[PDB]
Amino acid sequence: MSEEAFIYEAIRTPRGKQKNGSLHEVKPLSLVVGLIDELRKRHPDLDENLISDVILGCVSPVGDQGGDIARAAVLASGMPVTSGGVQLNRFCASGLEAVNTAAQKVRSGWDDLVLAGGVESMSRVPMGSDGGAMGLDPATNYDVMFVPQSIGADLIATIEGFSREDVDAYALRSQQKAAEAWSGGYFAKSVVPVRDQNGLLILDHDEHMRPDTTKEGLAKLKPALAALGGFDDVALQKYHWVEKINHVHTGGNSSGIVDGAALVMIGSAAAGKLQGLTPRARIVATATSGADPVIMLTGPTPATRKVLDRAGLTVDDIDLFELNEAFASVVLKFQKDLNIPDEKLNVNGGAIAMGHPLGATGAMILGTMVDELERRNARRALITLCIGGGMGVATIIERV
Amino acid sequence: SEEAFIYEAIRTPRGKQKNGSLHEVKPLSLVVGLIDELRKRHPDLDENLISDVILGCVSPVGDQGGDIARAAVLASGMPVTSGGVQLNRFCASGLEAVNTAAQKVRSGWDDLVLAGGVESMSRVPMGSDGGAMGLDPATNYDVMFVPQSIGADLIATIEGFSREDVDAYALRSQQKAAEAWSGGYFAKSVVPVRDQNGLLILDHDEHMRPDTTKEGLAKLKPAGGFDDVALQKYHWVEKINHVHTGGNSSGIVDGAALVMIGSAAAGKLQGLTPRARIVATATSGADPVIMLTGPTPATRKVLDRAGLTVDDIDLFELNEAFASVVLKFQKDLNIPDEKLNVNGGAIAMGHPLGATGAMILGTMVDELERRNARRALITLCIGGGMGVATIIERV
Amino acid sequence: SSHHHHHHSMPDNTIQWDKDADGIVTLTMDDPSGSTNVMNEAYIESMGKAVDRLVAEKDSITGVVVASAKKTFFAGGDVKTMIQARPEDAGDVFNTVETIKRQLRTLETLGKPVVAAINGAALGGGLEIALACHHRIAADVKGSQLGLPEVTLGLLPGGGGVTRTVRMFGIQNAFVSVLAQGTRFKPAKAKEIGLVDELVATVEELVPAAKAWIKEELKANPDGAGVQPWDKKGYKMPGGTPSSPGLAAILPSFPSNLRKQLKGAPMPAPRAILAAAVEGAQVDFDTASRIESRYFASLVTGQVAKNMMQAFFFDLQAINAGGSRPEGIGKTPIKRIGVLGAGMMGAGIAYVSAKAGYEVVLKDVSLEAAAKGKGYSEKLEAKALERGRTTQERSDALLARITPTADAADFKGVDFVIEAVFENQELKHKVFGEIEDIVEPNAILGSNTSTLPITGLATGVKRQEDFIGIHFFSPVDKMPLVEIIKGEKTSDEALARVFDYTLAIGKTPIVVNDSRGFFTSRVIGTFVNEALAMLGEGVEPASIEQAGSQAGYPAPPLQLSDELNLELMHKIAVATRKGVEDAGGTYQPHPAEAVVEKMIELGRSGRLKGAGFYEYADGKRSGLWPGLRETFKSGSSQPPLQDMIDRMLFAEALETQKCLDEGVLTSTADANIGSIMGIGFPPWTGGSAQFIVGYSGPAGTGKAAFVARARELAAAYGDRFLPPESLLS
Ligand SMILES: Oc1ccc(/C=C/c2cc(O)cc(O)c2)cc1
Ligand SMILES: Oc1ccc(/C=C/c2cc(O)cc(O)c2)cc1
């Protein structure tokens, strides 16, 4: 609780779509090595031996993402072999948990300069490829009342009273703000185009964005593992006061299945000054809590409220709110509960437009707020992600 | 600022690979059984104060996939606010979880954290998750991937450790592990595994061969062109002396371990007694073609970070992945022979990858209290050229 | 390691040994302790000696044939022993099934072909013995059945049934089709699904055809002789293993689909069968078998298994053995039956009476309606022709015995009357007066009544000795209970005639003394009234329905109230208030009566009116009435769900104890089976009377815990939950 943790770099790859994606031919290890090579290009005189660890979030650490992909990144990129490399899985907020763990390692004073981020090539390693106890253990599945994300989001919209037009209204809002951010050049210096072993361009934009989205086209989409029956009954067996679940979530108001990776360089003030690094933002506080595991998606609210209380701040003190756009109802509930002003919530669009690379999303939307706090010349931003099982993770950053 | 303390440190018995007693037990059940034992020792523990559960797991696939730490929180009925995160740092996943838990407590943003690991290698063999360094010819052909067993034989070749030398340490590990069990050293920490009816499944480390003799170790045989690959980097070595067998290498077993770590105020708020204090942690490494060399620079890093030397440490606990690794480590730092792995190691009791770091960590917590000794240093040779080290102090 | 029960007077011997000149041993099971080979201590020792002898003489043995000398092959086990298994006896239970499977596993891996000669019923451990063989031949004989129905008793196939069926059909097919519901199969159906390989016309061909298969298998396939598919190098589980990408995509939906089918009821047996199946498919056959033993031991030592074994075994045995029938009465068949009325009840009684081989006359007010009463049988026969259960030759015989008419003279020559026109005493008195003389002189005069006392209805006929209540349930083709109501003037002979008539039409009878509400209607009334009271108290209607479903009921209570018509419930309350204010006492109205009258005032009296607690469109429930929450301010009272669930179960359980105290019922077997099969009391309880002695909650178990929980509900919801003195010390 002594050393302050500072963000020095926060970059990410463009998010390639699932069907006919440009990044499908790129091994997820190469997505991380490309970002490491970009950090070297920006800081050629950085003694990489001072980097004590590389922490990558990955929700499906199997196949191309198995065998500690963080360690493979350290070895393949020619980094100093003493730089460690660890993979962690906290589902959706694995990317931010990696950043938070790196910040906490610097705070303890026992690590000095840490790389953090995530990687998720969902077109190559689909969600669920790793299996899991909940699934291969019917005794556990039957007890915990396992319910997928999409059903919990429909349940949130049913309880809170979010109509099908309400969620599609936010879905259009995300597509519009994401297109305005790209046209304004906001992502020009943080989205690092992916190239092959010859330097040829593979992808330079978030190809999942449908910027010509209209209200009428969103209404023609039909609601979407969850197709296999029983999950509605299991959900309503716990939430017995709810009679019918209004399935409002489609592929146009839910987070997109994409490939991508992100890297955040975190270290102490002494480490940055020794390497000639300008601190961009400061990690003010982090928090971890959760909520019910049958509704699952709700859970960011205690994490946001605890990180605000931990930093001694209120909602009014935060300039920008960045919540992962897993489902429109989750963001609408989060906005409704905390009375978040609309002009401060996901000001550059979210996962509905640009995609949700599970293990890498937490670091992507974190680095998004570092760039937007500077571009707006604002002070504080709060970044949070819901997680399956009800276990949110929130983080407050301050521009420096 | 805040100091991290160890309040509990338990582990399951290690069940062997072939015809193992724990083969029918899901690795999730191994963690839940340890959570229930923590409840038995502190039934009035406010579980809402537990902010995270950090489990190490090297092969998080099948029964161990889907964030097994989160599955343990839900299946055991723990509060849903208690988090749950799986991490994989090869052989150090057990100790990295403990270290991360201590670093989260030091930062002041977590109050009470559970840490440990789980590895059911009989159900999920290592390598079941795949990987790039093995299943990607571009990066495999570049980083010179060599199995850790060949690196251990290469260590014995360079340092001049004979087949008798590594087998001598193997017999020593069997003797000390058997002496610790009969002496009751593991009575409180090894939590027997039972089924859903309460019937006994396993109450001891069944991989141990306590009647080991040096003549029997010599009758063992040493277990894709990796020899040529290793010598291409260590070009001054003509031929590798393959001295490691199944008798002088770590056993493939199933097991799990749990450690409860929190701040001084957290334990005082919940009526807990500190058993030991986490003093320092460190991470470094060396050449990944020889792999198991991270412990030596990481041990020096944790000694300098705590302002201590070898003469200040009472007990040294290095994971017995291979006999040559421990002998190489003992010669480098001039470790006294009566201080090194005093209660036996993985050669006798087994090496359940993701859980070993937390097992040998809790093993030293008990031995410090049993001897009324002060300090102990715990290190594991991570796979791929890394190393973790942790210094604990008795309270 | 041993094939025997203990390593350190002895049991009997139930297996005969015979080795032919070819080296084929024929194990003939013939337990001298009964007419059926069961899996008791005598069998385990007998098979233990025989399996030992197969190994000792393995040089002079080329094949094995497992046959039976009973009418059945092998059926069931020792329920008298399993129902006594305490939780402390989990070690003995685990060791017993491990010994049982150790014998079959040695028989299965003998290096020689083993053929099962299934001459009759092979249920439970019987089919498990056959599954251990390499070839199964069944004699296509009448009455033969094959299946693993231990889930119906709260158990699971612990003798390898779970492990082997999953090895044969995969996780999904073995669970859904065989294990989850304990489905029984005729021999022809068994061969189709893979439970049986061959069929023979008569039982005398079994042992010869078995030895013929051994000889051909030894010559045609000498390498893989006596080797199961899961003991070969390249075995591939059908549908894949839990690690297969195709099965791992649908595997997480199996527990949710099961939790959907059971509606959240606390029935642990199907949950354990699925766990043992999936966990077993991840390991070798022997490790899978041991996991099967542990899940079996967790069920036998549990309470639900004891509730179901008490109800569906012991309680059903006593009823079917004439427990409530008078002791010394003779039997007299009936020629023709007369069903008065062609409603959903009268038409239903006409179908089940004809399907057992009895001529029926269906008299109604008009021939237009009597024809549509017989149409109930036509629409159930057309549903049996497209599905293929009955043939065309058989279906014509059923509908022929139904003679729909509107003339009262067609009842000439009827020795069994079953009236079902309407709940009105002066109507039944008039309807019976029009028919009591045209029928036979010694005819049974039955009446399908729900509440009107039989003694009062008998004052409208002459020979009251043959007047009795025969209460059926809608729909009659499905509901298996017949509530025989003994009027004050009914003779003991009339009880037996209706008793044997109930067994002749394939239904389960209970004998009930005359009382307002009898047993079924009176107890089920406390069930719907407790839910209506909850609605008036402000509890969410969706929670009330979920509470009824998670309790184990087949239909939620508000849904059932619409089908029972709230006008009838108001009608009963007026009658109950009439029998109290006239006897000299003050009436204590049930709090649900205020909700009944409110729904009547709003014109929503039930599904009959087309509007009740649910809305109706196209003749089907269209959801809960949106105005229902506004009418009763739903949500203002949010009790825990377990409090709602217990309030319904305890109301019926306490009302059943009153019926046993007043003399309405004479045995707990009638109370349990009558509540289960009559009003749909959840089977996991084992009956409304078993629910008391077998209660299990957070406070404890047993009758003492039931009283404590009843007093807990009484102090927080009303004095109606106070237990009678019969349950108090
Ligand atoms: O309604 C009923 C429900 C269940 C049963 C039990 C049937 C049965 C018969 C056997 O030979 C073995 C067995 O394990 C079960 C009977 C009637
Ligand atoms: O399908 C099956 C169903 C039940 C059983 C158990 C039989 C049994 C017999 C005993 O004498 C004692 C006992 O504890 C159990 C075996 C197979």
Residue numbers in the entry:
A (entry chain D): 1 to 224, 228 to 403
B (entry chain C): 2 to 224, 232 to 403
C (entry chain A): -13 to -6, 0 to 720
Sentences from the paper on this structure:
The Mycobacterium tuberculosis trifunctional enzyme (MtTFE) is an α2β2 tetrameric enzyme in which the α-chain harbors the 2E-enoyl-CoA hydratase (ECH) and 3S-hydroxyacyl-CoA dehydrogenase (HAD) active sites, and the β-chain provides the 3-ketoacyl-CoA thiolase (KAT) active site. Linear, medium-chain and long-chain 2E-enoyl-CoA molecules are the preferred substrates of MtTFE. Mtb is capable of switching its metabolic preference during the latent stage of infection in order to utilize host-derived fatty acids as a source of carbon rather than glucose or glycerol. The Mtb genome encodes an unusually large set of enzymes of the β-oxidation cycle; however, only a single trifunctional enzyme (MtTFE) that catalyzes three of the last four reactions in the β-oxidation cycle is present in Mtb, in contrast to other bacteria such as Escherichia coli, which has two TFEs. Here, 226 fragments were screened in a crystallographic fragment-binding study of MtTFE crystals, resulting in the structures of 16 MtTFE–fragment complexes.
A similar mode of binding is observed for fragment B-H11, which interacts with these two catalytic glutamates using its hydroxyl group. Furthermore, near the CoA-C(ECH/HAD) site, fragments B-H11 and M-72 bind at subsite I1, which perfectly bridges the gap between the bound CoA at the ECH active site and the CoA-C(ECH/HAD) binding site. The distances from the ECH and HAD active sites to the I2 site are approximately 21 and 12 Å, respectively, and the corresponding distance from the KAT active site is approximately 44 Å, when considering the distances between the bridging pyrophosphate O atoms of the CoA molecules bound at these sites. The path is identified by the fragments B-E1, B-H11, M-1, M-49, M-53 and M-72, in addition to the CoA-C(ECH/HAD) molecule.
